[PDB]
Design a protein around this nucleic acid. Structure first.
Ligand SMILES: CC[C@H]1CN2CCc3cc(OC)c(OC)cc3[C@@H]2C[C@@H]1C[C@H]1NCCc2cc(O)c(OC)cc21
Ligand SMILES: CC[C@H]1CN2CCc3cc(OC)c(OC)cc3[C@@H]2C[C@@H]1C[C@H]1NCCc2cc(O)c(OC)cc21
Ligand SMILES: [Mg+2]
Ligand SMILES: [Mg+2]
Ligand SMILES: [Mg+2]
Ligand SMILES: [Mg+2]
Ligand SMILES: [Mg+2]
Ligand SMILES: [Mg+2]
Ligand SMILES: [Mg+2]
Ligand SMILES: [Mg+2]
Ligand SMILES: [Mg+2]
Ligand SMILES: [Mg+2]
Ligand SMILES: [Mg+2]
Ligand SMILES: [Mg+2]
Ligand SMILES: [Mg+2]
Ligand SMILES: [Mg+2]
Ligand SMILES: [Mg+2]
Ligand SMILES: [Mg+2]
Ligand SMILES: [Mg+2]
Ligand SMILES: [Mg+2]
Ligand SMILES: [Mg+2]
Ligand SMILES: [Mg+2]
Ligand SMILES: [Mg+2]
Ligand SMILES: [Mg+2]
Ligand SMILES: [Mg+2]
Ligand SMILES: [Mg+2]
Ligand SMILES: [Mg+2]
Ligand SMILES: [Mg+2]
Ligand SMILES: [Mg+2]
Ligand SMILES: [Mg+2]
Ligand SMILES: [Mg+2]
Ligand SMILES: [Mg+2]
Ligand SMILES: [Mg+2]
Ligand SMILES: [Mg+2]
Ligand SMILES: [Mg+2]
Ligand SMILES: [Mg+2]
Ligand SMILES: [Mg+2]
Ligand SMILES: [Mg+2]
Ligand SMILES: [Mg+2]
Ligand SMILES: [Mg+2]
Ligand SMILES: [Mg+2]
Ligand SMILES: [Mg+2]
Ligand SMILES: [Mg+2]
Ligand SMILES: [Mg+2]
Ligand SMILES: [Mg+2]
Ligand SMILES: [Mg+2]
Ligand SMILES: [Mg+2]
Ligand SMILES: [Mg+2]
Ligand SMILES: [Mg+2]
Ligand SMILES: [Mg+2]
Ligand SMILES: [Mg+2]
Ligand SMILES: [Mg+2]
Ligand SMILES: [Mg+2]
Ligand SMILES: [Mg+2]
Ligand SMILES: [Mg+2]
Ligand SMILES: [Mg+2]
Ligand SMILES: [Mg+2]
Ligand SMILES: [Mg+2]
Ligand SMILES: [Mg+2]
Ligand SMILES: [Mg+2]
Ligand SMILES: [Mg+2]
Ligand SMILES: [Mg+2]
Ligand SMILES: [Mg+2]
Ligand SMILES: [Mg+2]
Ligand SMILES: [Mg+2]
Ligand SMILES: [Mg+2]
Ligand SMILES: [Mg+2]
Ligand SMILES: [Mg+2]
Ligand SMILES: [Mg+2]
Ligand SMILES: [Mg+2]
Ligand SMILES: [Mg+2]
Ligand SMILES: [Mg+2]
Ligand SMILES: [Mg+2]
Ligand SMILES: [Mg+2]
Ligand SMILES: [Mg+2]
Ligand SMILES: [Mg+2]
Ligand SMILES: [Mg+2]
Ligand SMILES: [Mg+2]
Ligand SMILES: [Mg+2]
Ligand SMILES: [Mg+2]
Ligand SMILES: [Mg+2]
Ligand SMILES: [Mg+2]
Ligand SMILES: [Mg+2]
Ligand SMILES: [Mg+2]
Ligand SMILES: [Mg+2]
Ligand SMILES: [Mg+2]
Ligand SMILES: [Mg+2]
Ligand SMILES: [Mg+2]
Ligand SMILES: [Mg+2]
Ligand SMILES: [Mg+2]
Ligand SMILES: [Mg+2]
Ligand SMILES: [Mg+2]
Ligand SMILES: [Mg+2]
Ligand SMILES: [Mg+2]
Ligand SMILES: [Zn+2]
Lengths: 143, 150, 25, 100, 129
RNA sequence: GAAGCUGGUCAAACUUGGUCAUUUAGAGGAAGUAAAAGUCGUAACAAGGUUUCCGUAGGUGAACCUGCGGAAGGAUCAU
RNA sequence: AGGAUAGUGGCCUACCAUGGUUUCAACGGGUAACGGGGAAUAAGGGUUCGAUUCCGGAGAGGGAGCCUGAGAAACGGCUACCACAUCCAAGGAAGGCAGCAGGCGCGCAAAUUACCCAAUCCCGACACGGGGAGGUAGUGACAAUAAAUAACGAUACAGGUUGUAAUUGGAAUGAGUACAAUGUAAAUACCUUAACGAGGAACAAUUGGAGGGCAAGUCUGGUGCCAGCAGCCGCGGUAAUUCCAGCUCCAAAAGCGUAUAUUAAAGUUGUUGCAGUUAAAAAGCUCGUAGUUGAACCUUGGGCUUGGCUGCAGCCGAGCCUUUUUUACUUUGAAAAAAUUAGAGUGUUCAAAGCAGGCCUUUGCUCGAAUAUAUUAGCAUGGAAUAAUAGAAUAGGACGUUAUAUCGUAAUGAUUAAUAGGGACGGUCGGGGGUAUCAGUAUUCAGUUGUCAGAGGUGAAAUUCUUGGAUUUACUGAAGACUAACUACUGCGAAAGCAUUUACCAAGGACGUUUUCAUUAAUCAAGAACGAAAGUUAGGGGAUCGAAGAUGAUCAGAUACCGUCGUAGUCUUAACCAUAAACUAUGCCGACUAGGGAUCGGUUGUUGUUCUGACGCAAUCGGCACCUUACGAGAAAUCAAAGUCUUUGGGUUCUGGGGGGAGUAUGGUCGCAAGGCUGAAACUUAAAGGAAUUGACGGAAG
RNA sequence: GGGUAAACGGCGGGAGUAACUAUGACUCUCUUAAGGUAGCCAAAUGCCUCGUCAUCUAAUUAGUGACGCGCAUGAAUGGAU
RNA sequence: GAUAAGGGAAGUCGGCAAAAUAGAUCCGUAACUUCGGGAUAAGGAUUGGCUCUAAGGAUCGGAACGAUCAACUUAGAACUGGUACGGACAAGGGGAAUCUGACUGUCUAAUUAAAACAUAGCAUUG
């Protein structure tokens, strides 16, 4: 009989069994455990500001061979230290020590993207100016 | 089948379609009743009374002749036992097994069988209590079981 | 490595952890 | 996957079978799994059955046989070519080989 | 154990029809089995059927005419309001023009079209097409 | 009929103790993963060159080795 | 019983009982929890959200106590404490933006210290006053509606009577600006509207992309595993379709991209509707309480009359005649806030909306502002199938409407016995169990005897024992183990497991039965019994093998494989441990679907057979299996179940949700310990994996 | 000649190395035998020594927790609890 | 033998000596554990006098009631006082750890009471 109760009065058993078994679904488990609230560096937010500590080059994973140019950022809201990728050709020259950068994820929702190892965030703005605007010379860095 | 085993045997009796006495049967509905009471006073259980009746008297079924089942007739004549027959034989078997177990402590098979027999006793006694054949406070006690089936 | 020996290695390491914690109870 | 429906032994409707030692290496092998061969060989080789009959003091003396039942593990038997690797479809054939 | 004699009866009918047999034996019988068969027979999905009295639950021999695609029970017998009949017929029947969901209503055991005619509803019991 | 007084009542608040809960330092110890395929060997995959694996128990630089009982997922559906 | 309260009430007091809730989840903990109307997404079923335009609750920095009053435990009221904090002449005094605006701080994250009571309403002694309630404008790409950035000719060409590609014309218009009027409390804007307002109509559309997924380049230059891109797969090492650019093209467009959450996709949470032999996953095996689920059976058929609706039939309703207690469920109804949803009407210029509006032009006439949905619970109601429940068994039973405890009425009252179960009984049948008991040779060790040079072990050796007689030989004895051959695709048991004889003890399946009871049953959280080997504790035994150890070989090294010894152990008695590839890697109960020959146990009928038994031939029930086929299933291997599963529902328990981290850490619990059971997360990762195919290889076979 | 360490007792000296640095996981030979295993430690046992690190204090040759080539720790001369 | 402002071990080799605690009733009690303990752990409240109230029994009489007789215990309340009250007497200080011996026990009468001896348990020998 398919291994689950079918009786008209077995709604409690069906509801409890489903409730027990949804904990095997990591999306449900992460939503109810609040891991983003407790464990995520951003605390569940989409973006987060921070201060650039140092500019660091990270070797890409095999089979790729390159130096992904990231920064070490200390978040203002909680003081945690994260590594954030600086996208596009030469935008590392736009990022200086002790700058305030707005960060966001890579879109893989907490996982590293591509060949970049251990990096889960990217720089969106620096010194309050969009990195895309700086790259395309639409605006200038206030200095 | 086999509540407490994996057997699936189907052997049993097949009652005839006819619900009337055979044409060759000549005894009256009374003479069977006095024969039943005579054997019940000799101490036979209803199963044995029916066995002696068909084996030696041609009474194929006591119901098709007398009109009542054997235990129903004994209860109508005050000869019904206090403990029902099947529960009595189950308790007697449990008494025999427990008595063997106290002398053979390493008989783990007998310990397992005793658990099966006693579970079957408790299920049957629960039924008899729900149908008010046994008192609602009736309980099977291993210590005092030998007295009932003495 | 073989699963049986991996299990044995982990059992010995749990044993060590318990013995180490017992020093300070 | 499953190679044999019999799991390489002959245990059905049974829990445990006591072991036997391989004749060649003394390995413990279940009695149903062991490769067993019954051999009845002449005790005297056919070359010597003549000179021993001539040296015999008895007229019409029958040479006794040698009865033996040999148990092999799978490795003993495969190595000694008592059994050989068969094709996937030929594995199912369990009649004695038609040689005798 | 034996929890649904209607399920056993319909399973036997389905297996005989799938194997091309023109008759099937059902044991045990019951009123629900007979009235389910009467609904199938009235709509032509089975032929004549026969009740055999054995001073017990009984037996039935059904004549099959090859028109039956599938008959089955719905366990459990859900309570069905009139507005739920549409959901059941949508899920169970192959098309909107043929097939029947059998209900047991206080007006009797009947197919969903007759139930709509007399504006009654009960518990779902099975289907046939 | 004011201040005030007696005894109650509701009871904020502080000190100590207990408990619950959430974060965090730490000499040292012991891990995991990622990186590169650096040193030592060759345990597994072929009968992997001692068939492999399971439970258990000893031993050992390391893979691992050995005993006992199992399994075939065997290298035998078979005499 | 009182007190208190506006009043009921352990609301409080006194006395007295010992009660009340809970596996149908109490109590505790968490909530990044105010509840609901609702919102997003949606085939259906669902999943997620709701601080926030309405309703209810609560609070006014945290607590607490009050005054006044009909109404407050009020804070734009007071009192006190705590925390903040203002002025001070140092004696003192005054505070509460979670109202409006505004500031700081916090942060990814959110607007003016503007105008007004004109509207909506409220308050007051009130036609008159007040209202940051509210309205108006400002900021405002939160979302939503409509909708510009051009249109048309002639030449010139190309082209098959017309679609364009260019250089040549005359028209059109609002974006913007503005008299003015309207709007409005006053303005702003909208709507109208003089004059102005378009050729590069510079009055100039952007955001992302062009390897695949995925629509659109194998163009040109630059770089050269760098720089970079790339959600994923991947691109880049000198002709890069992927980077940086130019050209060209593609998609959506006043919008387009990115991050995060969520929904669909996801039948990857599965009630509908998953999977569990081998991919993750059937508990080692039974018992068992709650839970879930449970054979059949009790007014059916017939006859007559009649109402309604669909085109003589058919479909519903009736009404008579035929012997004529509790639920659940389903129908209908009443009562169910608006907004939102669906939906009727209605030219807001269309539309989103709104609830307006329409008439020959009105000293007025006049369609409207529908209707559905809610859904558990409660209320009322029709129906009596399906599923429960009760009744008359020591009769303490029912009727006497007008019967007098008795009497009389009555057909006086008990459903089958399920190829469910339980029990009895009858001949059996088993290597099922326990306790004794009885063999057997072997091994080793010992005693006697006999010879004499080796014996053992190996691929070869060596360790070892040997003229002190080894090894070998016969007889005898003692110890512990173990039960060969017989022995099998055979038996028994819940499994683990069980094999010498006999006795005793208590069990058991199957079969046979015209015996008995009548639902007593199936599966089962909690809770139990048993549970190979190894291991632990303590006695006893310690022949043989033999972890550790010692030793001789091989080897580069092997404290490995091989050889000789060897301690725990192996055996047993009392207890522990609770695990195995505890495997059929396949839960249990029930039904059905296909052929065949064997075989074990029981029973029933029968021989060219040997001597009652054996055998032979037939049936059957139960088992252990096997062979063939594939109706059917499956990814396949394969499967008579792993079939009767998108044509998806017989009952029920357990387990799984990509790979690791990890059966780890932590907490608990059991254990003497070894350890068992329960059991995460951070982080990391694009595969890991299953079955099969071709090849290659193999110290595999032919 | 054999046995015996819960008999007395003993349990060491020597020889090389990892794509920065540091360390050394990586074999045989001698003493009459074996060459210190599990554990534990500047300990009532460590000379150097007031060892080094942490903690405790304003300050600690004291105390505790770590470390360990330990002058000269260590298993019924019983080891660790 | 007593007392001592403020401080409170700065004294000293070292809290030596002294002080502090102390009865009873009620509340509350951690790590660890050989499950027996630790434990009086730690840490709190009360306590007089007087006037009352309630509960707790025996023997007789035929009664869930009467008669007579009788012991000190416990609990509650009011009042009262220079807030005192185990009023003298009597009477634990406590906690976190390390070393060491398991424990109770024993010896150097007359300088050493200990970690020494013994011990149960374990093992060996004849
Ligand atoms: C057990 C350890 C090794 C020791 N060494 C030394 C050199 C050697 C030389 C030989 O030849 C001169 C020789 O003969 C065969 C055997 C040896 C042994 C063989 C053994 C290897 C073993 N593992 C697999 C191979 C194998 C084959 C056998 O036959 C065989 O039997 C004993 C055994 C084996
Ligand atoms: C007359 C008796 C008294 C006099 N007072 C005066 C005040 C005073 C104050 C003290 O300190 C405030 C103090 O300090 C101790 C002692 C005294 C002496 C002690 C003496 C008796 C005493 N004599 C010596 C030992 C002794 C032994 C006993 O058996 C014994 O019992 C009768 C008594 C004694
Ligand atoms: Mg049901
Ligand atoms: Mg059956
Ligand atoms: Mg097994
Ligand atoms: Mg029925
Ligand atoms: Mg119904
Ligand atoms: Mg908490
Ligand atoms: Mg190898
Ligand atoms: Mg190998
Ligand atoms: Mg090798
Ligand atoms: Mg090897
Ligand atoms: Mg070894
Ligand atoms: Mg070996
Ligand atoms: Mg294989
Ligand atoms: Mg009252
Ligand atoms: Mg009261
Ligand atoms: Mg709750
Ligand atoms: Mg909240
Ligand atoms: Mg929403
Ligand atoms: Mg809400
Ligand atoms: Mg909410
Ligand atoms: Mg809300
Ligand atoms: Mg709202
Ligand atoms: Mg509100
Ligand atoms: Mg309020
Ligand atoms: Mg406020
Ligand atoms: Mg306040
Ligand atoms: Mg207010
Ligand atoms: Mg207030
Ligand atoms: Mg205010
Ligand atoms: Mg404000
Ligand atoms: Mg606020
Ligand atoms: Mg423009
Ligand atoms: Mg691009
Ligand atoms: Mg394309
Ligand atoms: Mg190019
Ligand atoms: Mg190039
Ligand atoms: Mg390009
Ligand atoms: Mg992007
Ligand atoms: Mg989803
Ligand atoms: Mg799946
Ligand atoms: Mg596997
Ligand atoms: Mg698996
Ligand atoms: Mg199983
Ligand atoms: Mg069971
Ligand atoms: Mg039911
Ligand atoms: Mg039924
Ligand atoms: Mg029956
Ligand atoms: Mg034998
Ligand atoms: Mg047999
Ligand atoms: Mg079984
Ligand atoms: Mg259950
Ligand atoms: Mg359980
Ligand atoms: Mg022993
Ligand atoms: Mg060697
Ligand atoms: Mg040996
Ligand atoms: Mg033992
Ligand atoms: Mg075990
Ligand atoms: Mg297991
Ligand atoms: Mg197996
Ligand atoms: Mg398993
Ligand atoms: Mg099961
Ligand atoms: Mg079945
Ligand atoms: Mg079925
Ligand atoms: Mg037979
Ligand atoms: Mg028969
Ligand atoms: Mg097959
Ligand atoms: Mg099979
Ligand atoms: Mg997983
Ligand atoms: Mg494969
Ligand atoms: Mg050393
Ligand atoms: Mg050491
Ligand atoms: Mg040291
Ligand atoms: Mg230490
Ligand atoms: Mg010292
Ligand atoms: Mg110091
Ligand atoms: Mg000091
Ligand atoms: Mg120290
Ligand atoms: Mg020493
Ligand atoms: Mg020493
Ligand atoms: Mg002083
Ligand atoms: Mg003082
Ligand atoms: Mg002080
Ligand atoms: Mg001092
Ligand atoms: Mg000092
Ligand atoms: Mg000093
Ligand atoms: Mg000092
Ligand atoms: Mg002192
Ligand atoms: Mg105390
Ligand atoms: Mg002592
Ligand atoms: Mg002295
Ligand atoms: Mg002296
Ligand atoms: Mg002294
Ligand atoms: Zn082998």
């Amino acid at each position: 009989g398919k291994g689950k109760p079918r009786g008209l009065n077995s709604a409690r058993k069906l509801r409890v069994h489903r409730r027990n078994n949804r904990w095997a679904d990591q999306a449900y488990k992460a939503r109810l455990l609040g891991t983003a609230f407790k464990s995520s560096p951003f605390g569940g937010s989409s973006h987060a500001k921070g201060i650039v500590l140092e500019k660091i080059g990270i070797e890409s994973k095999q089979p790729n061979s390159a130096i992904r140019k990231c920064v070490r950022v200390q978040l203002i809201k909680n003081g945690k230290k994260v590594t954030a990728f600086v996208p596009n050709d030469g935008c590392l020259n736009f990022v200086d020590e002790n700058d305030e950068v707005l960060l966001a994820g890579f879109g893989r929702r907490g996982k590293a993207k591509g060949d970049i190892p251990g990096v889960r965030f990217k720089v969106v703005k620096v010194s309050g100016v969009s990195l895309l605007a700086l790259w395309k010379e639409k605006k200038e860095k206030p200095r | 089948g086999r509540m407490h085993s994996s057997g699936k045997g189907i052997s049993s009796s097949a009652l005839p379609y006819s619900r009337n006495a055979p044409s060759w049967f000549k005894l009256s509905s009374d003479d069977v009743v006095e024969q039943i009471i005579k054997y019940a006073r000799k101490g036979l259980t209803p199963s044995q009374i029916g066995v002696i009746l068909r084996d030696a008297h041609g009474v194929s079924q006591a119901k098709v002749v007398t009109g009542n089942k054997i235990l129903r007739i004994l209860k109508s004549n005050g000869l019904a036992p206090e403990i029902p027959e099947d529960l009595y034989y189950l308790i007697k078997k449990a008494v025999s097994v427990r008595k063997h177990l106290e002398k053979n402590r390493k008989d783990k098979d007998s310990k397992f069988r005793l658990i099966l027999i006693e579970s079957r006793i408790h299920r049957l006694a629960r039924y008899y209590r729900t149908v008010a054949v046994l008192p609602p406070n009736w309980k099977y006690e291993s210590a005092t079981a030998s007295a009932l089936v003495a | 490595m073989r699963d049986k020996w991996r299990k044995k290695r982990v059992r010995r390491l749990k044993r060590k952890r318990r013995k180490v914690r017992a020093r300070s109870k | 996957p499953k190679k044999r429906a019999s799991n390489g032994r002959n245990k059905k409707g049974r829990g445990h079978v006591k072991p036997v030692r391989c004749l060649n290496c003394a390995r413990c092998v279940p009695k149903d799994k062991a490769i067993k061969r019954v051999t009845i060989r002449n005790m005297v080789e056919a070359a010597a059955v003549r000179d021993l009959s001539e040296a015999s003091v008895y007229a019409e003396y029958a040479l006794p046989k040698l009865y033996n039942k040999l148990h092999y593990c799978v490795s003993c038997a495969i190595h000694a070519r008592i059994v050989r690797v068969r094709s996937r479809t030929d594995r199912k054939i369990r009649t004695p080989p038609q040689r005798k | 154990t034996r929890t649904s004699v209607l399920a056993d009866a319909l399973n036997a009918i389905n297996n005989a029809e799938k194997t091309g047999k023109r008759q099937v034996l059902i044991r045990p019988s019951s009123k629900v089995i007979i009235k389910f068969l009467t609904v199938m027979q009235k709509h032509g999905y089975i032929g004549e059927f026969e009740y055999i009295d054995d001073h017990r639950s009984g037996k039935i021999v059904v004549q099959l005419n090859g028109r039956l695609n599938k008959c089955g029970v719905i366990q459990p017998r859900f309570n069905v309001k009139i507005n739920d009949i549409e959901r059941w017929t949508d899920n169970l029947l192959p098309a909107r023009q043929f097939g029947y969901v059998i209900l047991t209503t206080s007006a009797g055991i009947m197919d969903h079209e007759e139930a709509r005619r007399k504006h009654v509803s009960g518990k779902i019991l099975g289907f046939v097409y």
